[PDB]
Design a protein around this ligand. Structure first.
Ligand SMILES: [Cl-]
Ligand SMILES: [Cl-]
Ligand SMILES: [Cl-]
Ligand SMILES: [Cl-]
Ligand SMILES: [Cl-]
Ligand SMILES: [Cl-]
Ligand SMILES: [Cl-]
Ligand SMILES: [Cl-]
Ligand SMILES: [Cl-]
Ligand SMILES: [Mg+2]
Ligand SMILES: [Mg+2]
Lengths: 67, 67, 67, 67, 67, 67
């Protein structure tokens, strides 16, 4: 459990591993998708796998707002 | 359109203006909220106000995963 | 057409595809080069290729200022 | 030198100070402008003021592409 | 349990509040200091104050290398 | 030499090269580790290698604070 303001729970629906990074796609409430690129080491350490229930976290200063 | 893979449509449910930045809270589908800190100039340009329909845009490399 | 304050129009002069990401190099006005690392999926979806006229976009909070 | 691939020399054409941050607008070559939100402490350390010659530094993973 | 590979424990040695954000300086092990600009909301939720033990969390793609 | 507020000197203890990016792990004072993902081009241009003494740099707005 953490205090971060932006926490979106979802289910992993896609995982593509590279050499240094990995792309994780999560389906969140309503069904919308969140895509994350993290280190491959983290995928392994956190045991990220298709179907896993995980949470996407984003610092507020990284959220752009467009029309 | 734009390369950022996370484009979440939502409505403004919170707005706090500073002098250089502003904090905007959007309610997206499924009831999740996402908070953004952006420049006050962008707030003015988009006419951000309570109820406005806007899009939160996040690069995949800015999304962390919490297990 | 977007409202983002930082928009730099340029021509793709370099493209290197990885497994998860891709590196895109744009020559902007005057000749300055801008390098972007985006997801490979975006390269494909946006149809990014050598010679294409595209625009680089950057959130203001990601711009460091040095001497 | 530094790893950030985007190092854009420019002159300060806009400056707005907050208490924690500041907004700095640089005019780079070819007439493009780039806006940055940085800590007020950095503004003071660099002596940021209108006309100052500074460098905007952006990591490639923070550059989005708009097609 | 979070993917960000940089998790640096430290104590608060500086705190400056704005209206939307706050600047927090943490002294980590070995005497290094790290400065963060975060939302004022987070400062209040974590009870940030001088001496507080907190963790600075940084995504690997946000770390530049200077040679 | 640069003015950036966050500069953490360290020794490269890990290096993994991908096609577009590379993962650099630095042991900083106290012995703790900082992980950076930069472009492969930069590794080559800066001559980054195991054992090298380098400095990690982070913009303050990219530093999240957690309990
Ligand atoms: Cl895979
Ligand atoms: Cl993206
Ligand atoms: Cl911004
Ligand atoms: Cl290629
Ligand atoms: Cl870079
Ligand atoms: Cl900053
Ligand atoms: Cl990371
Ligand atoms: Cl924040
Ligand atoms: Cl290697
Ligand atoms: Mg980033
Ligand atoms: Mg950022």
């Amino acid at each position: 459990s953490i205090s971060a303001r932006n926490q979106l729970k979802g289910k992993v629906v896609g995982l593509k591993k590279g050499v240094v990074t990995a792309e994780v796609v999560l389906e969140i409430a309503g069904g919308n998708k969140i895509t994350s690129i993290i280190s491959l080491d983290s995928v392994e350490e956190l045991g990220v796998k298709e179907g896993a229930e995980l949470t996407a976290v984003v610092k507020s200063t990284d959220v752009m707002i467009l029309a």
